[PDB]
Amino acid sequence: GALRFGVLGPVRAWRDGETLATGSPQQRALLAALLLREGRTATAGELIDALWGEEPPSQALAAVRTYASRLRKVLDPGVLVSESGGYAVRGLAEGALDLARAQDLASAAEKARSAGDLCHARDLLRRALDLWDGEVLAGVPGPYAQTQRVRLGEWRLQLLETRLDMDLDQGCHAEAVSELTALTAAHPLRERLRELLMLALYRSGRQAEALAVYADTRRLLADELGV
C-alpha cells in the first residue's frame, strides 16, 4: 500500500512497485506542481499559470477540473484534497517523494561531512544521484515545469561537486578524472569542474596536461565572453 512518486525523472507514480497510468503531460504537470510544493495548497490561479503561463486556453479553469478528476480515478481517495478553491497533496508517507527522500540523505551528507565520516557521506550521496532517472520533468510542458527543471538540474550539480571534493580528499583521483572530462564537455562554462579536473590530472602525474586545461579555459572565457 506504499504510494511512491517519481519526479527526478519522468513523472511516474507507483503502488507496490506497479506503475500507475499518470496520464497526459498536463496531468503530469498538475501532479508535479503539487508534488514539488510539498503539501502547500496551490490556488486555481497559480495552477493556470503553472500549466500555460501567460497564454491559457479560454476554458482553462474547466481543464484543471478535468485533469484533477482523472487523477482522482488513478490515485487513491484522499491523497489529493481540495481546499480553499485549490488542490494539495496530503497523507504521504515520509520519503514517498524521491526528491524528499534524496533531501534527507543530502542533508545527512552535510551532517556526515561535519562528523568527519566521509565514507558514509560518499555512499549516501551516491544513492541520491542514482535516483536521477534521466532528464528531470521529462516531456512536461509549461513555465513552472521549466523553472523546476532548471532548479533541479542546477541542484544536481551542487551534490556532484560536493561528492567530488570528497573523492579528491580520499585519493580516488583516477576514477574521478575520467567522469570529470564528461562534465566539463557538458558544462563548458562551468569553471569549477575544470578546477577539480586540473587538480586530479596533476595528482595523476600529468602536470603538463593540467596547464593545457588552463590555457583552454582562459581562451573560452576570452573568446566567447571576454571575461
Add this chain to the structure above:
DNA sequence: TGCATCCGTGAGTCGAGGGTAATAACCAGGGGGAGATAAACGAACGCTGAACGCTCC
C-alpha cells in the same frame, strides 16, 4: 409749570491661560429595537465521461 429721582451707557493697548453641586424609592406592566436560525436562487467543483480530434503504432 418746576423740582425730584432713577435708569441706562461707557469707561486702551497688546501679552498670560482651560473643569464648577445634591435627595423615599420601588413592582408592575409592557412596548420596541438589537442581536440569534432555516429557505430561496445561482456559481465553484465534480465526477460524469461523453464527445471530439492529436499524435503514434
